[PDB]
């Protein structure tokens, strides 16, 4: 029952890669603490806060602001978003 | 002011919400009972012999 589905990529979601942020599609039943813990378990990078929102398509989009610099770019390269 | 189309624009509120037990919009918001399945009034489902015809 993983909280993470996949990184969310649109023109606006790739507008935050320069800002160290990375927006994910997660499980709508999850909370901010579960998303933070599961992202830190999945990649090891430390997260500073979680900006969650639920969309009209029935999904939940989470924006994780990392603490270490370039963690968003590293995760994007490891997933192949960039 | 009339009873027809004049006072039918005051229909900006509800008296029945979508009931949990049956997913039908029949849960009264004041008596706390669904008028289709009877959730909030009884454990069993409301079903009456007058909901169909006499079988003869």
């Amino acid at each position: 029952m993983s909280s993470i589905n996949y990184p969310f990529v649109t023109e606006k979601a790739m507008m935050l890669l320069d800002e160290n942020k990375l927006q994910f599609i997660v499980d709508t039943r999850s909370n901010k603490k579960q998303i933070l813990e599961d992202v830190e378990k999945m990649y090891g990078f430390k997260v500073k806060s979680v900006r969650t929102m639920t969309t009209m398509k029935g999904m939940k989009k989470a924006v994780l602001a990392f603490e270490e610099p370039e963690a968003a770019h590293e995760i994007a390269t490891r997933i192949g978003l960039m | 002011m009339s009873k027809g189309t004049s006072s039918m624009g005051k229909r900006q509120k509800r008296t029945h919400a979508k009931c949990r037990r049956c997913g039908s919009v029949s849960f009264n918001v004041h008596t706390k009972q669904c008028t289709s399945c009877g959730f909030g009034k009884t454990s069993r489902m409301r079903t009456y012999k007058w909901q169909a015809k006499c079988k003869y």
Partner: protein, 51 residues
């Protein structure tokens, strides 16, 4: 700005994505025998039985 809880917005989300046409390949695969479904609707009509 009606103030929905989580379940009300979820029901409206499902109602929104139900209101889309059939895909083109379904019509092509079915020999054009499946061209619509009953859940087509327009927002300026009969209101949703959702909330």
């Amino acid at each position: 700005m009606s103030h929905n809880m989580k379940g009300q917005k979820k029901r409206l989300a499902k109602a929104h994505k139900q209101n889309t046409r059939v895909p083109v390949w379904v019509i092509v695969k079915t020999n054009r025998k499946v061209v619509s479904h009953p859940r087509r609707r327009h927002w300026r009509r009969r209101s949703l039985d959702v909330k």
